[PDB]
Design a binder for these strands. Sequence first.
RNA 1: CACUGGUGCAAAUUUGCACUAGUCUAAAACUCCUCGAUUACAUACACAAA
Length: 874
Amino acid sequence: EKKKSSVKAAGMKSILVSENKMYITSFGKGNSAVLEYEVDNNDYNKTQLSSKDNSNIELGDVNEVNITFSSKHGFGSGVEINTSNPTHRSGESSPVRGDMLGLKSELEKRFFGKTFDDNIHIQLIYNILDIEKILAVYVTNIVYALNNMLGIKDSESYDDFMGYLSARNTYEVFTHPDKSNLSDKVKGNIKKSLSKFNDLLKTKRLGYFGLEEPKTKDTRASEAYKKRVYHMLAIVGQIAQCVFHDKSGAKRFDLYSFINNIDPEYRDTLDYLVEERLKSINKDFIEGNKVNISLLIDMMKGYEADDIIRLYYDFIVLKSQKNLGFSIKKLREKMLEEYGFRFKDKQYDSVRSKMYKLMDFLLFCNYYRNDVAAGEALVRKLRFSMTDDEKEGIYADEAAKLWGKFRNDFENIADHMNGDVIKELGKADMDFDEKILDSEKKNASDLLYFSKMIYMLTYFLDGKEINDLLTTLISKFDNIKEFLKIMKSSAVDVECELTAGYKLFNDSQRITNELFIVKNIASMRKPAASAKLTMFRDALTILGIDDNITDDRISEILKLKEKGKGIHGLRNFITNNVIESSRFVYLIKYANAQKIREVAKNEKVVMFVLGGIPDTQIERYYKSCVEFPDMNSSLEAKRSELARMIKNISFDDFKNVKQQAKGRENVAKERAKAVIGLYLTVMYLLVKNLVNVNARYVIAIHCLERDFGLYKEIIPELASKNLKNDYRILSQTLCELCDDRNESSNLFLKKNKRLRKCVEVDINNADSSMTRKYANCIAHLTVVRELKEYIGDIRTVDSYFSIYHYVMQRCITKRGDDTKQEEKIKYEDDLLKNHGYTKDFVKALNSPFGYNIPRFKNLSIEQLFDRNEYLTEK
RNA sequence: CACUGGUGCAAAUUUGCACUAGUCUAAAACUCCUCGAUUACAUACACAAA
Ligand SMILES: [Mg+2]
Ligand SMILES: [Mg+2]
């Protein structure tokens, strides 16, 4: 069983090191740090900074090698914990640890204007680098999705569209480049992007993102919509220019300041988008939430109605229940599993979300207002826990106490969870003034432009993508705010003036809070799109249709241009089950409907995805999708059956479905919905996993360009080098320096001669041409684009990593039909014979990333790649 | 099945293993928030309708 660090469990958050002192911190609420002690490195004298009430740990003996301490709150019944004194390292003169890359001094100069004899500034800086790494993944995906949206399947060019946009050009300059005072090359570049912009508008595919063109054809409304879309694309392009380098090796330095420095029209667009979302939630919130609010007021006897309304607004928009230090949902889930299993019954499926909100709200109020001490006690037990099993036990014990307290309340909620009561509560008068929430309401004016810019990015993202980007940004800003607070403390008091480009980080507290709200509002369902003919073609094509069907034929089959009563059942069925599916939208955004349908014919690929689905879920899918299920068949037979259904699905299968189903018609309709849902889920899982694998490589490219720029300032040997000429130059130069010199900036290569020698072999196996192709394929999501072309050639489909590398290797070794015979790569012959990726080829391709050994090994060895795989063998 | 530090056995000129840490390693510091993830998520029961 994996065990946690006892040092973290006991309460020691961090040991900050300066040249003469160490500062020990303990965990406060959430990410807060409690300064506990200051220790002198030379004489080991200690001074307690914490008050008797605030202190969480007791410091014992401190010496050159070890630090002994114990919890003041009972961890391990007060057991003594021994941790290394961080200043004790052989072969290092300084008490202060350096970074593995050796870029700590260059980074401190870039962010703070000078070097420091402490390890605090570098920790804050690594948090900023993490923000850039995650933005690099999402902008790369968004740019690919926008290009993909065009439908130009055969196209050498890529960034003629997003690459030529600039946030420094207003909409007027963009639409009238000639009337500009810009260079002729620039004017032509703008025209190329303008033409692509009109191409994107013509597709009608922007509706997938919630960017619907206006219903009216009025010129004024049309231009206002186009201007907003242009601002969104130009901002995405600007972010891309800040996290990736251009042809000349240059990148913009205004990522954190540009939004406040560009034309005010861009800021108007950001306000318009956020105001639209906030105004829909905020307008008549009490009337909009009257059913739950009425039930809660009747149920919560110890609270004033106005207080409940304010708490409910918090629960929906602020989601304070998600900042408690434990999972409210997990507690509710444990309560239902052990004691309220009846509420998990099929009859509550239609009202389950409402029922869970009411149950979660009671638990939230219990810990947020009524029993804050119980919440603090629960966090301490979870922090003290050393294993996953212990943590589950803590949630289970808490659920048992909660059931005794809320059993009657939960039964009461379940009694009201039916259509008759809900319809009744909906029609009932709600005499509460909407102005009660004026003090709690969140408005667009309350947020920074940086926060609004992040909200704008969410239009292009799926809920999982929003969760991944936002939770990562929130965590990094929270860490940065804490590091600044520690450095500015009376006890530490070290200079930390950020340079002009990074002044935004001074507002890291406010940004962390605003970003949390952005995650909540961005995660909410947007109004359904007006389905356009393009979407209907996408839906019929993904299901399976004649390759040469005309737009007029699609209109005819779905009666799109026909007016009448009850004649649109098929159109409505396709809209509800395909067009409105987030899984379908994800597939159209990153893939091609016709290509995905062809990939679905490959039973080995579909069986691989089905294999990952839990056995209980396969049984549910088998029962819902198969008309006459053989329940006595094996799980492999059931998976094999579902794979055959997916291979044979077509639009034709659903042409007679009855959308307004009566009686027995319902059985066929439910089965059709189940089959479409499984088909979309299986294809979505495959594409999403490949996009996710690609993201790891995108981080590697972003880091290599960033690291090359930093190393270039301190390595004379890199002085005349251009990275794009040969991507292997950083690893090659650093490996050579380790062999020929004594001093080394890069510790990964210097410390591990065996791994350094391995990287040297991998560099030699590669060349400038193949590495350049790899970087281009990673940046353009070529593996996802060309998946249908090569996935069929894989003999055994056993991992996302192996699928990605096989397709990538086929793309790299493809001999251009337009170009002449080029230096055939030495791995091509075996790859074509093997029908599987070549392990040595991955290492050669990844040789540019060799300077960061953990990244290089994780990206080159299938067993080390995924943190969620090989848990038992790990 | 990683990387780096400390400690402890071993080991000449390769280092290896064990225990333990690390926000200054890797998508990677505790509790959260997340992801894996499919069972779904989502200010408005569901269904139908526009
Ligand atoms: Mg030393
Ligand atoms: Mg880190």
